[PDB]
Structure formats: structure tokens, C-alpha cells
């Protein structure tokens, strides 16, 4: 299989507008937040969704583009394929007894799944397929000033269980986030590519996925998510050329000078993108 | 009198163990058993004080005893919230030694659980947050930190308020 | 032990003046049939989610005065006797002064209860 | 089932003179506003429930333009009427145990109700008929400029109660928006149109809606609204070839020169709408 | 700690004022009973509405000068000091300034009670 | 071989963002703290395990810089490899009685293996290599402030065996360090060296190692680990030139004035370093 050659560190910007970017299952369900300085946290692991969801709706199914999928899946079943597909017994709990056995079951499930490919997946259970990292890490969305989320009541002129006045009245419940720029950090390492094949094609749908996540994640609760910057860094080689933080520290991203009050459009933001060092090219055309 | 780092061993055991029934063929999931409890209790009395032997005296006021029932009754708010399989995240040992900095955050998450439980018709249920305004009452501030002897009337008060809030008593025929 | 008026602690006079907005806020309606809560972006955001909390209790207050029932107008002169002594609203708090702000509101909430504190 | 084979944006503008355009449940009943900027917020829910009760109206519930009825429904005794009419027994609290038959049900809950069939529905409970998503999403609607929400204290000549208080008067209240011009946002998704089946006469019954949404929803409490602008963005591909805020940022909406105070009429507001993109396709006829 | 007549910070003077203004026209006519209520637009959007207040508060003290009741051209007096402290009234304030803004208001309401501020 | 001569302290600052530096086995997998105090720790066998692992990628496994893996290696087989490598009998259940096949059997268990000739090993078992102390020591790592693990709840749309009660949805767990600057001290003493061979490129190897840590240990539970200082104490002899302590004091670790909230950047934190006694070099340049 074909790898990526490269060490790869983005910069992705989105923001909401009146929409719960990602809901708190344990705090209700409002937007999550950094409960001691308020700016707003929405998970990597929605953002991966929203990834999976794009490459789902835009290849189709199509073979050697799986998506561990959605549609609730039992993922044993998805284990036992790649059993099947390589004629070894998964009666055991525990891997092939061979190394290249465990190698060919893992090599399968990475070879045909779009997501194992690239984000890794812990395919250790009843029949186990192993464990993989996958090269694209991403990390929590955290938003550049403290989101205050409101909760809004609304109402349903309809019952579901028997009610004759709706005088009792029920309402229900939206949590909206008025507005946030959030700015999530992401890596793509080389040497986890050499071990499941991340290649070229596998990047190159990786960035428009980023770019138009939001743009067929429509719902009743979203409101208007957008991506707004995506800045990529791009080392000249397959390991680093130079430390994250300092590439995510060139991404400054501040407050317009003609906005004063509370941000409410990405025009009172201001985002600027220092020179990149030596090693490293910068490419802002996403 | 016992050795001086029996109770150490007995608060060192809460911490480092976590309930896993799902392991044990004996029903016990708790964290401070009948006999991590009773040999605390032993402890405080030959080496310390005289201390509640009872199933719980709501009288008591000190406020190890005191902060020890309200840290079992925010996680029975929590295990009736949500089913909690039957695992939580371990502060037994954060909240026992240092009150203030980790009991913040589990009245907050307690509050969000009181929430949770009054979404549902399980509130006419709303006295979990009764008991504790009444036992926050007697708790001018939450304190820095906890001597062993202070965490050991935490636990013994924990095990109390812990067996008041079930429903498993005097079952023999 | 119990509330100490005279305790004039910023974190504890916050968890006071949240304690007695919240109950105005039921005094309003009972609970509109739930308790609204954002506690959390309050102690996350002390003065961002006061301003708009107190904006509310207003509301409540107002909407209060045309019914004979009170416990309405107390609410207020309560407002007024625990903002006096706060200036200058926190940004962030920290975990000992978020315990302190828990313990304020509960004690707050013991003194309005239906039995004005007289049992334990 | 035919459906919609491409991707459609839209701005709605509307306003209100002298009326409350959606009160807040929680706050009094006062006009929805931001509660840091001022600027009155309309849900989208009120809106879809606007486009309902117009289907509604024009229809007079024809077959397969079922409404979910708003003057009183039962949503139990709908999923059952979908459990019956597809031969199930709706015992279970959960879907059937074969794909086919839920992927049936919902599948009859989508062919025979308008609203469902257009923006989605939850009807998972005591029993359950799934979810849809529905292609077409609106987001809240927000005001141009901060409205400033006037309270008007007003009386009546009767008591409602065998109770001696009218010197002693009762006093009711009205809250009117002296006047608010809204921009309302929207989405449609062609893939999810293909999920229901929302076809080309179910758009022009949408298209027909949005223009005469409040010319049949007057009340003593709303005023003069009126649909003033709906901007229509076709693309030319069922996955859209502009992102939908380079789109929405085309509807510019200022102030006439010849206005300085604050507004009090749609012409103190010029609207201007920009060039679409090579792939897209604008249309401000409605 | 209380008002401060010496902060000088544009929300907390903004906040004086609003407080000022509405005890004023609360002066002038009964509130009958009932009162149109805009604090939220006052703090949210300040100059769109200290327009129209002051406009009002000017021609409640027009109203007065006949009248020698005086507690009043003291009310006009505190405004004139108020407004003398604040240049260039804002166009929107943050959520940090409207807290700042009901601090002082509430300050403000504590100072001219009935009883003067002579009782907490 | 030859060794290094030289008294090596050095104290490394890394940083953890919206990440879970190290878990604890008995508390869930909560980040490890002091819970009497609150700070987070984080063990030496971490950081070694980070530094093993980073060597065993920046060499690919190559002649002398094998590295004790972690791909379920059996360390019996790697001693009885030894033993047959000086051709002896690995069946002794201690020692070989000979003393300088004891001698060699562990000069071979050092020669090529860097984690053991760095860090030290325990080859005393069924199949006995003996002991090492190894030049390199390190010490937990802790914070420079208390941390706040706040645990955020997270789900997963499929479930991994046949489950029956999948609306509903499985609930998954995540815990992260919202912010955490930690402080670890190390040792490098030149006797054990003398006696393990550690030479001055595998003094070079570990800074390297040191700085580029983090740049290749991602996963979902990390976030963004980076190591932002690194000061280094060479004292100008084979013992000591100054206490431990005396240098561990020198770099001081406070937070900038202007920041009042909690800490959440590393600009929100002033590191000052003192100039070293006569006997002492004192390089921060990592």
C-alpha cells in the first residue's frame, strides 16, 4: 500500500450561529464547556462524525471506503468479516496466534474502512481484530471567547401521551449557542500511515471533508456551522520538522478593531497566520 | 493500642480499589465495606474518640462526619440519575483529603443529576437536594484539607449515611 | 450553624444572590414547569450569566408585584442588601471559591425555605 | 418516490410593525431578543409551524398532504394508524425486528404527511416510527437591528371571576415590536429529500408557503408581518458548489441614506444581492 | 463596600443613571401599579435607549420646576453629575459591562431608598 | 565502550492541553493526582516509555538501539538470546557461576539495547541476566499547580456485541486536563554510565528525545502534549559539582502577572532560571 510521505499539522476554524455545535449527554444537553473559564469544548470525536459522515454521503459505500457505519451497526459482525474474508477462527478471544495472522486481520479491516484507515479503531472484543492509531488525531474544539449558552422554551402544540388542555402546558427545550469561533488543532503522522496505508487520495478527501463538514450536517439543533479557515502545515519530511505548538502559535486569531461588543459574525473576528519556519510550508487555500 | 498505620492501610485500600461486581461472585460493589468501615471505627475509638456506632446519628455535626453524608448522598443522586456496567469516576479518595477543591465540581455534577432525576415523573426524588441544603447548613466552609483521623470519620460517616439510603434491612425468617 | 449575613465574601454573596434569583424564579412559576438551570456558566461565568440572570429575576419580580402573594418585594430588597457589598463582578473563580459559592446558594436556599429555617 | 435532485439556499426576510412576531415562554411573554445585543430573535420553529398551518389551509388535508394537526393531535394514535396500515403489531416500545418492516413504517409516515416529509420528525416513543431528519432546515431568524420591545399596559371592562374588584381595575399588557425586519436562513439537502421523497410539487407547495406565510396568521397580538424578500440559491449538483455562507452573505441588508432614525418601515432598509458563484443559480422572484 | 460615587467607569455610570432616570419617573407618576419595563434594552444597547430616557427624565423635570417638591431638581442634579462622568455613550457593551451595569444600578437603588441607605 | 564524564541534571517542562497525560489504574483512568493536594502526577515510567518509544521510531529498530518492545515481546526469550549470543547455558535458574559470564551476559544485555543501557533493566527471572541500574534516572513528574480533571461524557452510535436495547445509545467516558504544566527532574550520573557504557550520542539521542517527545506520541486521549523547556545542569565532573536540589531550585516556575483566571496557555506562566555556581553549566537551549 501507498503512504503518506509527509507530516501534516491543520488549523481548522468553524463557528455556529444560534445551534448547539455538540451537546453535553451529562449535563442536560447544553454545549459543552470549560466549566472554570466558560469558552465552549466541543469534542474531536464530533468533528470525526461529521468526517464519516461526509466521506459516506460522498463515495457512496464504495469498496475500500467503509465507514464502520451509522446505520447501528454490530461491530462484531464487521470483526467477524474480516475473519471470514482472511479463513482464520475467531472462536478465541484473543488475536491469531500467528503475528502474520494478526497482521493480515488488521491489514483488512485498515485496508477496506475509510475511518479505521484514518482515525485507528479498538477492534479488541469477543472476536478480536486488534488495534490501530491511525494517522489523523485530532484534538478538543475549544472557541477563541467564552460562549454564554442560553437556553431557549419552546413549545409543541401536540401530545404524544393523552393530555385534553394543551391547564397544564409542557415545554420543551433548545439550547442554542448565540455564537462561537471555535478552532480545533489536528495531526497526521507518516510513520501510522506506513502501518495502515493512509494515502494520497485517503488526504486529499481528508481536506474537503474538512472543508464541508457543515455543509450537509444540517439539523433542527445546528443552526448555521460553517468552516471559516482551514490552515494546513505541511513538513518536508516523515517525521516533524518543527514542534506543533509553534505552528499552532503562528495562528493568531483575534478580535476585529471596528467590533466592540458581544462577537455575533465572523466578521469581528480577525485571523492571521504568521510565517512558517524553515522546514515547513504553509498552505491556506482551504 | 492498634499500630499507627493501620488506618493509613485501610484509607490507602479505599482508594486504590473501585466497584467491580461484575468480578466478584459475592454481592458486594462498595468501596468501603462492612469490615474496611468497622476496622476504621475501631481505630478512631482505641487510638482517638468515641464515634457513632450507630446506623447513623444525624445528630452528630462534625464536619468530617457531616461531609462524609453529603458525598454519599450526592453519589446515591448520581447511581439513581443514571445507572452507575455500575461505574462512576473515583473521588472517594480526592473529596476525603481534600474537601473543597473536588467537592465544587461534585455538587455541580450532583446538581445536573437532581436535574436529570426532575426531567422525569420521579419527583413529587427532590429530597436528595433537601439533605443536602441540610447538610451544607452545618458547613460554614469547605475545608483545605482532612487529617487521616478527620478521612477516617469521613469514611465511617460515608458507610453510615451510605446503608441509611438503602433498602436492604433485617431480611431473616 | 447557618447563614451568616455578615459573612460578605464574594463567592458566598454570589451563591446567595443566585440562590435567591432562582427563587424568585420559581416563586414565579412553579418548577416554566421545570427549574431552569445554568448554574454551570454560572460559576464558569460569574458576571457574564449574572447580568442576564439578574435581567430575569426583574422580570420575575415585576410580574410578581401584581399578585397579593409574597414571602416578592423581599426578593428585591434582598438583591439590593447582597449587590451592595459585591463590586466589580469576577471573571473566572476558582475551586475553593466555587465550593464557597455552592455553600452560599445552599445556605441562602435553607433561610427561604417553606419553614424558614426553624427545623433541621 | 420522486425527489428533489439538487441543493437549494434561501434567505427569507419578514417583519412585523406593531406586533409581537414569537413570545418567549420563559421570559414573561415578551418578544424573543438577545439577551446581550438586543437584536429579536425569531425561532424556526414558529416559522415551520407558520409553513404548517399554510399547507394546512391550502390543502384542507388532501391525501398524502397530512399535516400533523395542530388544533389537537395524538402523535401515539398516528405511529398506530403507521402500524396498522402496514400490517405490524406495534406492541414493542422499539422498532421492528426486521430492517424491512421499519424502514416501511417510516417509509408511510414520510408518504403521507407533508410536515414529516419535509422537516423531519422524532417519533420514537410508546410507539415507535423512527426519526427523519427532513431535507429542508431553517435556522432562528435575527433581526437586522436591535429591536426595542415596548411593553403597552392596557384594560378591560369585565372580571373573569365571582370576585368584587372592579378605583380598582384590571390591567392586561401587550409587548409589540414597533417594527423588526428578520433574515431567516434555510436548507435543503438533496439526500435527504431521497431519504422521504420530497419532490418538485412539495417544493413549490414550500416556495408558496414562505411567501404567504402570514397572510393567514393574523391575531390581535401580531401586527402587520409580511414576507418582504426571499432570495432562492439553486445549485447545480445535489451536493452544493458554494459553501452556504459565501451565499447567505450575498443578501446584503443597510439602511437607506434618507432614514436616521431609528426604522420604522421596510423603506428605511435597502437590500442588495450579489453575484452567485459559476455554479450556483440565483433566483429573487418570490 | 457600596456605591462609590467616585468609580468612574462608563457601565457603572450608566448603570447610575439608568437607576437615577427610573427613580425619577417613578417619582413623577404611580407604578398605576403598572410600568413599561426596558433595563434589558438599557443595558444591552445603551445609547439607542439613554436617548429616549433622557428625553423622557428631561420633561419629567420640566414638569417639576413648578412644584417645590424636593427630596425633585435633585434627581436632575444627580443626572447632570452622571452624565458629566460619561463622554460618548456606547453603541452595545459587553456581558462584563452589563454586569457592571446592574452592579451599579443596584448601588444606585440602595442609595435612594426611602430610608436613605440609613439601614442594610 | 566509552561513556559520558560529566554530571548531567536537567529539569524538562511539558504541558498538557484538553489531554489526559497519564491515567491511573485504581481511579477509572482519571489523569493521576496527589489527592491530598490536588496536583496532577505523572509517573517516571511514562516518560521513559514516551522516550523508548520515540528512540525505537527515530532508529527503526537498528544494531545497538534495540529497545525492550512493546509489542508483546517475552523478556525470558530476550535473556535466553543473550545467553546464546555469549554462548552459555541459560538454563541456571541465577546467575551463571563463572563471574565473567554473569559479566558478559549483562554487558550484552547493555550493549544492545538502549532502554536498558539508559534507564537501567531487571533481568532476574526464570531465565536470570541480572541487574542494572542505568545512568538516567527520572522522577514524577508535578505539576506546577493543581489540575482539575473534568470528565467528559461521550457516545457511540454502535455497539460492539449483540445488545437489545439499542434512540438509546451506548455512553462512553473521557477525562482531560483542561490545562496542566508540569515540572520533571532527571538524573545522569557518570558512574553508572561508566558501568553501562552509555555513551555521549546516546546522551544526544535522549535531549533529542526529550524535546520531540510528544511530537509523535497522539492519540484521543492526549490532546496536545508538548515540551516547552528543557534546562540542563552539566556539572564539570565525573561526581557532583552542586546538590541536586540547588539546581532544581534555580529554574523557577511562576505565572505571569497579568493572567488572573486559571492557567491555560503556557503564556500564562513565567519560568526564570538562575545563573548556576562556579561548578555548574547551565544550558537551556532545548
Chains 1, 4, 6 share one sequence.
Request: with cysteine.
Amino acid at each position: 500500500m501507498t503512504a503518506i510521505a509527509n507530516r501534516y499539522e491543520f488549523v481548522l476554524l468553524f463557528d455556529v450561529e444560534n445551534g448547539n455545535p455538540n451537546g453535553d449527554p451529562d449535563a442536560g444537553n447544553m454545549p459543552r464547556i470549560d466549566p472554570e473559564t466558560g469558552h465552549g469544548l466541543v469534542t474531536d470525536v464530533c468533528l470525526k462524525r461529521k468526517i464519516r459522515n461526509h466521506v459516506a454521503l460522498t463515495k457512496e459505500g464504495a469498496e475500500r471506503f467503509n465507514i464502520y457505519i451509522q446505520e447501528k451497526a454490530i461491530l462484531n459482525e464487521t470483526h467477524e468479516r474480516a475473519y471470514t474474508a482472511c479463513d482464520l477462527k475467531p472462536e478465541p478471544k484473543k488475536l491469531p496466534k500467528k503475528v502474520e495472522d494478526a497482521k493480515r486481520v488488521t491489514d483488512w479491516m485498515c485496508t477496506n474502512f475509510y475511518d479505521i484507515r484514518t482515525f485507528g479503531a479498538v477492534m479488541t472484543t469477543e472476536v478480536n481484530c486488534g488495534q490501530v492509531r491511525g494517522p489523523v488525531q485530532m484534538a478538543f474544539a475549544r472557541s477563541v471567547e467564552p460562549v454564554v449558552p442560553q437556553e431557549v422554551s419552546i413549545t409543541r402544540m401536540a401530545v404524544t401521551t393523552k393530555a385534553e388542555a394543551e391547564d397544564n402546558r409542557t415545554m420543551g427545550r433548545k439550547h442554542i449557542v448565540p455564537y462561537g469561533l471555535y478552532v480545533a488543532h489536528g495531526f497526521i503522522s507518516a510513520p501510522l500511515a506506513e502501518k495502515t496505508g493512509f494515502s494520497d487520495e485517503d488526504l486529499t478527501l481528508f481536506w474537503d471533508a474538512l472543508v464541508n463538514m457543515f455543509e450537509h450536517d444540517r439539523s433542527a439543533a445546528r443552526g448555521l456551522m460553517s468552516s471559516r479557515k482551514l490552515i494546513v502545515f505541511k513538513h518536508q519530511n516523515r517525521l516533524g520538522n518543527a514542534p506543533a505548538h509553534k505552528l499552532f502559535d503562528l495562528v493568531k486569531v483575534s478580535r476585529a478593531e471596528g467590533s466592540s461588543g458581544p462577537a455575533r459574525s465572523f466578521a469581528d473576528y480577525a485571523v492571521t497566520v504568521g510565517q512558517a519556519p524553515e522546514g515547513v510550508e504553509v498552505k491556506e487555500m482551504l | 493500642p492498634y499500630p499507627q498505620s493501620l488506618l493509613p492501610a485501610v484509607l490507602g485500600r479505599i482508594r486504590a480499589e473501585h466497584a467491580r461486581p461484575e468480578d466478584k461472585s459475592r454481592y458486594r460493589l462498595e468501596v468501603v465495606t462492612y469490615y474496611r468501615a468497622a476496622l476504621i471505627k475501631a481505630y478512631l475509638i482505641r487510638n482517638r474518640k468515641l464515634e457513632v456506632p450507630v446506623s447513623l446519628d444525624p445528630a452528630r455535626t462534625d464536619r468530617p462526619y457531616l461531609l462524609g453524608r453529603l458525598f454519599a448522598v450526592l453519589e446515591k443522586a448520581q447511581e439513581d440519575a443514571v445507572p452507575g456496567a455500575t461505574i462512576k469516576d473515583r473521588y472517594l479518595a480526592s473529596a476525603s483529603a481534600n474537601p473543597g477543591q473536588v467537592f465544587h465540581m461534585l455538587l455541580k455534577n450532583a446538581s445536573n443529576h437532581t436535574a436529570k432525576l426532575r426531567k422525569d415523573p420521579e419527583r413529587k426524588a427532590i429530597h436528595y437536594e433537601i439533605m443536602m441544603q441540610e447538610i451544607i447548613d452545618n458547613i460554614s466552609d469547605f475545608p483545605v484539607t482532612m487529617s487521616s483521623d478527620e478521612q477516617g470519620l469521613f469514611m465511617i460517616g460515608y458507610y453510615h449515611q451510605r446503608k441509611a439510603l438503602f433498602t436492604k434491612k433485617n431480611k431473616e425468617n | 450553624v447557618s447563614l451568616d449575613p455578615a459573612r460578605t465574601d464574594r463567592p458566598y454573596l454570589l451563591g446567595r444572590l443566585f440562590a435567591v434569583l432562582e427563587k424568585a424564579q420559581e416563586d414565579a412559576v412553579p418548577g416554566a414547569t421545570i427549574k431552569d438551570r445554568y448554574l454551570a456558566s454560572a460559576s464558569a461565568n460569574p458576571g457574564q450569566v449574572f447580568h442576564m440572570l439578574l435581567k430575569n429575576a426583574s422580570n420575575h419580580t415585576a410580574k410578581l408585584r401584581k399578585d397579593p402573594e409574597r414571602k416578592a418585594i423581599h426578593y428585591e430588597i434582598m438583591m439590593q442588601e447582597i449587590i451592595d457589598n459585591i463590586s466589580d463582578f469576577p471573571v473566572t473563580m476558582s475551586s475553593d471559591e466555587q465550593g464557597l459559592f455552592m455553600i452560599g446558594y445552599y445556605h441562602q436556599r435553607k433561610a427561604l425555605f417553606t419553614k424558614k429555617n426553624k427545623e433541621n
